[PDB]
Design a protein around this ligand. Structure first.
Ligand SMILES: [Ca+2]
Ligand SMILES: [Ca+2]
Ligand SMILES: [Ca+2]
Ligand SMILES: [Ca+2]
Ligand SMILES: [Zn+2]
Ligand SMILES: [Zn+2]
Lengths: 351, 542, 550, 351
DNA sequence: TGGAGTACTACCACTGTGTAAGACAGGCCAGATC
DNA sequence: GATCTGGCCTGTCTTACACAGTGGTAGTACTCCA
DNA sequence: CCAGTCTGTAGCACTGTGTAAGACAGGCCAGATC
DNA sequence: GATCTGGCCTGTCTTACACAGTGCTACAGACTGG
């Protein structure tokens, strides 16, 4: 439960506020970066090395039979657990293109070969979607569920630009929440089906959701309709009957007023909800710990690691989980002249 | 008495603040007045027929994704960003017009001169009033060090030539061709942003609406009350007046000195060493879309560099369509810089000494500046301006420099090289080559060929496989583009860049000062400084 | 109807319009409407040469001492022919100035219109009032530090600059009977930059006595050699005489110390005029005679240097009474009406802080109680007088503090009503005696406060050393000794206090900055010349008159 | 011969381009503080010390029988050989004060009492000059001589201000070479005499002089009249053929053409010259050596230590001699920014 | 019908004399398996 | 312990980035007046 | 004689700029000490 | 005899403020017509 001020020796210009940190097969890969993929690494994804409080960003390289990814900005990430027959995957969907545009594409990323000399090859497949496909959104959440006895994906939330008729060039960069529809996606086939929620009367965004044994928990987030942050957690239960994947939901009584959080996994189903924003200006400093049970969520507040003045005065902050009780947070720095590494970094661990 | 419009012209054409103009007016009225100037509060409404959002208009059919209210004015450049902290912050302060309203204000301002063109051509004025054709040249250039620089980016356009095709049976009749697109006196601003120049994110997230209405206006037509009639208009957009780096950044090519030099042709760098003349101009916007799709989806399961080469350096979905042509001013700067390097090298020796050290080139540059100040009266400069280039391109600079070269063969060689360059230079610099100097354009192919072979023969010590990109552009694309695109130089980004000092001065004597208001009033002035109405009232018959 | 060339020169200078700017709008308005409304550039430049120095012929009888009798000299280099030999003291300091006498006759002939007007009002026969004229002159020398010219890529010391300016205060007549004076012209507001003409500009700091003396020496020699003789001027068609008196007032106390030799700054010798130390200012706070004069200070420096009594170091410094450095310019060290409150303001702030808290029962306070009293006093002022706390007492805060409102508001905390009424009476006498020095002329505006000031300050000091004896044991802030010991003697010796403040140059700092900003030639050797030419053109009474503002 | 970059730990703002360095009874004193004597020091005569390569500056105090000296900038220094009455003494006359004028007052400085606790008390007695007094000037030179066997002093050279007839406030600061006459000063009383010879065709300035056995050698300094630097060394031999001070002079062949030269004594009559300025734009760079005996002056070009680029390239420089072979030089540390310690110090030693 | 005096427009001096990014060549080295 | 290789370094090369606007000076159109 | 109506001038929001009062600190002597 | 810490004195950073201007706005007064 402590922090450590790191330093980005070089490459301290390739991080933007919302970014992704995929943890597969040990090393962490940073995904999404400022600007199009430069030629230092044409594939946009950087292996992250944490050595002596120092931050190294090594280039990665995809397969030949893979596809190439635009560096999505704030997508939804679903850690597709090791199962037959291609472990172990990550589902990225659908994110924000560095060119200011949404993308409804679904990228299935995985590891292919290694090393021979510590080199890590990745592969990335565009997964066509059949439906009833979910329209292009961002900030949403995707999760995996294994129900009796097959694996599916639950997609929900996230904003989107105005519908393509009311979007006026003066209201272009406005954005409203996508319709409150859940989407059940099968990795194969991509027959993505949409489903309503007679209880979720409103969409939302930046809700850090979780899944446990084909039972999903949408933690509270932000709703731009009424500017409210409904702490009421959302439980739901899915049963993939043949061939209709029936769904039910329930409004949990109490949750947490959290927005744009980092979820570091501690146990098999134990997570630290690390921090984000609880108000429009106030940031949630205190940590949180959630155990996922078949009874349900078990919440407790751990000791918040002491915050330096630097991290406390800052207007904003963001980050991503390095896994195994570890994560990385950042602070927009100030000073004269440009550092130009305008982002200070704090590594954080539990226990 | 003085017409109010003239007095507004005098105010903004000399950078006077309301305090200054008010004191001047009070004083000149109290003595021998007989009110001569007009006060502030009457000018502060006497311009409303010059800024955007005064002249009614419409389209047929209506524009997509563009509200049809025609009375809008200065709008915040964010275009309504949900300020919610949780998302990407709505940080950057900007202002702009609505491209359509700007265009209609420009046209209805040129009303006088379009009517003059109607009358001078002896054409009927009441009929043949539905098929006008406008050529609009855009330009968008960054700007640093506007005191950490803060590096604001500016976006401007210019009505280049308005022609008429009515009633048909023909191609068109050039009603009015702008006489001077080079100077900023006709280069009107449309969008100002306090965005750094290279960060794709905020640049796109603010330019998006502009590019959107640009793409939307290409289809329909415009209706304007001009010359008493409700006439019509069609537009064609030339996206030329960018520099090279920005064209690359908004094109999807990996800037800047990549293995793929040409913005228009896909010839690699090494292949631009042996061959220097024969090339084809193929890079187009739609083709770049298709090539980026072929990269992203990767339908052929190729490896990294192989796939890069199948698309020829296209790894970024471009968005702002750019006509395939080179700037004129930066071509001069690039050319000048390269001749300066070659001079620095030939004051010393290179073909006799393979790898000279750093201090040697330092001293060679020093003694070159010595020879160029002792004669020709030229001082050193950190970064090369247009004027220093024009001076470093003339003959007598060569007659002075070549004096230091020991080998008289090299002396005569670079003298003949500069001769070729002066014989071929006014091709792209001209306003209209086929009218100003047709003989250079006629003799440009063979001249370029002889020049390229002279370089490859007497300088192969240096041009083994490295070629600056403007060399390639001026040696392999000039004739094709001049044949196709009518002219060049008449589409220089100069009109933007040299105009930019306005936004410099307009931050001192016309600030507010607060970025919420600073861009607003800077834009207001910088526009009001351009309309031909006011330049007419400024010249007032020579 | 055409426009006079002088009007247009004024309307160019007075609004900082540049040459190219003026010419552009000129050709514009000329080709616009069929007339030569404004005059063009070169004729305006020729017609302006009437106002700059070096145009009117004059004479001086007896002739000046070690001063060239040429009258056509213009803008001279303040170096004064500094030998440029490298081995010697460097000669890079940029500076430009006028020849003092030429500038003076130029400013006088400018005011000639008003002096003739006053002679019309006074009905003095013009063919008779010829020789008995006398002019009072103020001269202020402040160093406007750290200017930013907004185009700096290489340091060329473009920050600090001392601006030696002078101003004609008032001109009177002397002929012919007793008639020791009739004020023919009293400038109406002698503190504003509209009338504060520059004489010498130097691109140096006010710190290094070396360069400052090296470039001011000529000006000092002119000031001296111009005290005795008479100036002959062809004014109003008559060869008339003028005698001068140079009241030099507008220096900051720092510069006054630097030019009277007094050890700077917070020395045991606070007052520049009396010899009393801090303890002798605390014992008796009212009765003091203004004694320090330029000649006496010179003699004191001689006493210190030669040490004719072989007394020890500290005893010698005490016997010379503060004079350790040779003065080099006779200065009239009047009270500076600029601050004139800020020291008094911070003293009343400390007194309130130590009166809400208890200091005259608990003699030795610590940090926490002092800061707590400050906190609660500031909260009280926020509650009642609606004044937020600040770190430094500026002007307006002092002005809004030393008022009976804030005082009767803060009275509610001090428990003993004895001390309440005591400090209220303190502030009462203070704010009654305050406009004696601030306002222009207490001999016309408020003669009652002046006539009462002696007994008023006496009661004030008695109240202090009676009920606040705990704090003025042997230490007193300088401004309090100033306001209690010399105000009547000062206003009696001269006739005012606020009418000789340094306000002129404190304002004209903005003028210098603006002229460097939009009118400079940027050559770093012509720049000063342009700044000086434009600044002088600004402050010529004639041109402000053509700015009638009717 | 070696150079070393020193650093002014404190009291950096009290060194001006001209200054003097005196030695007597060990410690070295610095004379000529810029500005006027502050409250830090009553006198202004600092005591300078090199402690671990750092310049420490302490205050000196004066006795009661002593008079107080104004801070002359470029005085005419003269060390007095240790003998009756007060061995030793130092003659200073008269330089320029912090204000633009000359003292024209000779001062005899010496040490009176010590320590006790490592303190030094000095005395500064004025010695009035009755005559036939040498006019006020600066940059001239004074030296001690012993003529069979009485001790007297010779003064010569130095610029001055234009006489107060053509002294005009348009050229109020233009200086002129004082007429070339040798002035003879006796110390008790100050019965000074003036003398001339046709060999002194012109008056010089900043010419470093060196006396020995009542014979004085004047080097070549600089002249403003002809704007040239006469490399003609000037020998002169005098003796007090009581009661007439008979003098004779001679133009020798060669003297060094450097101006404002530092002189450090190494031996009995041996002085290393670090050199101030050879050419009126290009400063002297080498380091020479002057011996002298009845044979005459013997010059030898010692090895000049390799001047660091910072000192070697900057325009001007100055300094003094710490005695016993060592000396201090200083260069204007002009650049971005001013510390405001604007003079870099270098110690330079012989052998 | 010509003269020169007017006004305009064209010159000159002058700040400082390096940067900030990114692609690629190539050297080479950690460090890790072999 | 030997290889060897992906990854970091260093250097070199290419595309931009600022440096106008202001007074003084003088040719020089050019023209108001007799 | 009066009201519209036009003109002049003051007030507001704003942050870039210089300034000097105050925090402080460290450095040296006095005082107490080794 | 020889050394060290509190007082304080003064040289240094620093930072709260006011002051500068600028466009817009709003009010206040002065002119002119019925
Ligand atoms: Ca550019
Ligand atoms: Ca540019
Ligand atoms: Ca001052
Ligand atoms: Ca001041
Ligand atoms: Zn090409
Ligand atoms: Zn006093």
């Amino acid at each position: 439960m402590s922090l450590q001020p790191l330093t980005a020796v070089n490459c301290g210009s390739l991080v933007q506020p919302g970014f992704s940190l995929l943890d597969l097969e040990g090393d962490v890969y940073l995904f999404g970066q400022k600007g199009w993929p430069k030629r230092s690494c044409p594939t946009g994804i950087f292996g992250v090395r944490i050595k002596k409080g120092e931050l190294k960003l090594r280039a990665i390289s995809f397969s030949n039979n893979s596809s190439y990814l635009p560096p999505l900005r704030c997508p939804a990430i679903a850690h597709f657990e090791a199962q037959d027959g291609k472990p172990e995957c990550y589902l990225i969907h659908g994110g924000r293109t560095p060119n200011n545009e949404l993308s409804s594409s679904l990228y299935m990323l995985s590891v292919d070969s290694r090393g021979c000399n510590r080199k890590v090859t990745l592969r990335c497949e565009e997964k066509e979607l059949v439906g009833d496909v979910p329209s292009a959104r961002y900030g949403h959440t995707l999760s995996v569920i294994n129900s009796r006895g097959k694996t599916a994906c639950v997609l929900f939330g996230g904003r989107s630009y105005m519908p393509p008729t009311e979007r006026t060039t003066q209201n272009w960069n406005s954005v409203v929440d996508c319709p409150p529809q859940v989407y059940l996606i099968d990795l194969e086939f991509g027959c993505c089906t949409a489903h309503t929620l007679p209880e979720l009367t409103d969409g939302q965004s930046f809700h850090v959701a979780l899944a446990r044994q084909d039972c999903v928990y949408f933690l509270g987030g932000h709703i731009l309709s009424s500017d409210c942050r409904p702490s009421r957690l959302i439980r739901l239960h899915v049963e993939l009957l043949l061939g209709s994947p029936v769904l039910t939901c329930t409004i949990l009584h109490e949750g947490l007023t959290i927005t744009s959080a980092i979820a570091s996994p501690i146990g098999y189903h134990e997570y630290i909800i690390f921090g984000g924003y609880q108000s429009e200006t106030q940031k949630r400093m205190e940590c949180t710990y959630v155990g996922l049970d078949d009874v349900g969520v078990h919440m407790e507040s751990r000791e918040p690691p002491q915050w330096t003045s630097e991290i406390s005065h800052s207007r904003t902050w963001f980050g991503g989980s390095l896994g195994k009780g570890t994560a990385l947070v950042a602070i927009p720095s100030e000073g004269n002249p440009t550092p130009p590494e305008a982002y200070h970094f704090y590594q954080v661990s539990f226990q | 008495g003085l017409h109010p419009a003239v007095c507004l012209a005098i105010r903004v054409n000399t950078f006077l603040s309301c305090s200054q103009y008010h004191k001047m007016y009070r004083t000149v009225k109290a003595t021998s007045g007989r009110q001569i100037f007009q006060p502030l509060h009457t000018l502060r409404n006497a311009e409303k027929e010059l800024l955007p959002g005064f002249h009614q208009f419409e389209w047929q059919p209506a524009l997509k994704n563009v509200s049809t209210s025609w009375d809008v004015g200065i709008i915040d450049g964010l275009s309504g960003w949900t300020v919610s902290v949780d998302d990407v912050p709505a940080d950057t302060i900007s202002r702009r017009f609505r491209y359509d309203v700007a265009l209609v204000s420009a046209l209805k301002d040129l009303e006088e001169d379009i009517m003059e063109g109607l009358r001078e051509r002896a054409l009927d004025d009441s009929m043949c009033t539905s098929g006008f054709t406008v050529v609009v040249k855009e330009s968008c250039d960054g700007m640093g060090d506007v005191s950490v620089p803060e590096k604001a980016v500016r976006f401007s356009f210019t009505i280049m030539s308005i022609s008429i095709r009515l009633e048909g049976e023909d191609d068109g009749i050039t009603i009015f061709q702008e006489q001077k697109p080079n100077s900023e006196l006709s280069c009107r601003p449309l969008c100002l942003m306090f965005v750094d120049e290279s960060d794709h994110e905020t640049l796109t997230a603010i330019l998006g609406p502009v590019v959107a209405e640009r793409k939307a206006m290409m289809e329909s037509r415009l209706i304007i009350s001009v010359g008493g009639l409700l006439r019509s208009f069609r537009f064609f957009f030339r996206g030329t007046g960018y520099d090279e780096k920005m064209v690359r950044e908004m094109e999807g090519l990996e800037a800047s000195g990549s293995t793929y030099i040409c913005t228009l042709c896909d010839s690699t760098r090494a292949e631009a060493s042996q061959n220097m003349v024969l090339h084809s101009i193929t890079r187009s916007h739609d083709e770049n879309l298709e090539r980026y799709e072929i990269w992203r989806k990767n339908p052929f399961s190729e490896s990294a560099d192989e796939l890069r080469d199948r698309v020829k350096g296209v790894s970024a979905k471009p968005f702002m369509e750019t006509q395939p042509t080179l700037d004129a001013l930066h071509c001069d700067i690039g050319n000048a810089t390269e001749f300066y390097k070659i001079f620095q090298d030939e004051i010393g020796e290179v073909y006799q000494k393979p790898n000279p050290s750093r201090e040697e080139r330092r001293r060679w540059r020093s003694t070159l500046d010595k020879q160029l100040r002792k004669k020709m009266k030229l001082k050193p400069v950190m970064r090369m301006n247009g004027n220093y280039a024009r001076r470093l391109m003339t003959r007598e600079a060569v007659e002075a420099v070549c004096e230091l070269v020991p080998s008289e063969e090299r002396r005569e060689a670079l003298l003949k090289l500069m001769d070729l360059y002066l014989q071929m230079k006014p091709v792209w610099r001209s306003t209209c080559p086929s009218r100003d100097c047709p003989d250079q354009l006629c003799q440009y192919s063979y001249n370029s060929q002889q020049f390229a072979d002279l370089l490859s023969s007497m300088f192969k010590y240096r041009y083994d496989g490295k070629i600056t990109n403007y060399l390639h552009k001026t040696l392999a694309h000039v004739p094709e583009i001049v044949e196709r695109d009518g002219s060049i130089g008449a589409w220089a980004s100069e009109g933007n860049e040299s105009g930019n000092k306005l936004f410099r001065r307009f931050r001192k004597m016309n600030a507010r000062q607060s970025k919420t208001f600073e861009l607003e009033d800077i834009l207001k002035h910088h526009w009001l400084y351009t309309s031909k109405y006011l330049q007419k009232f400024m010249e007032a018959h020579k």
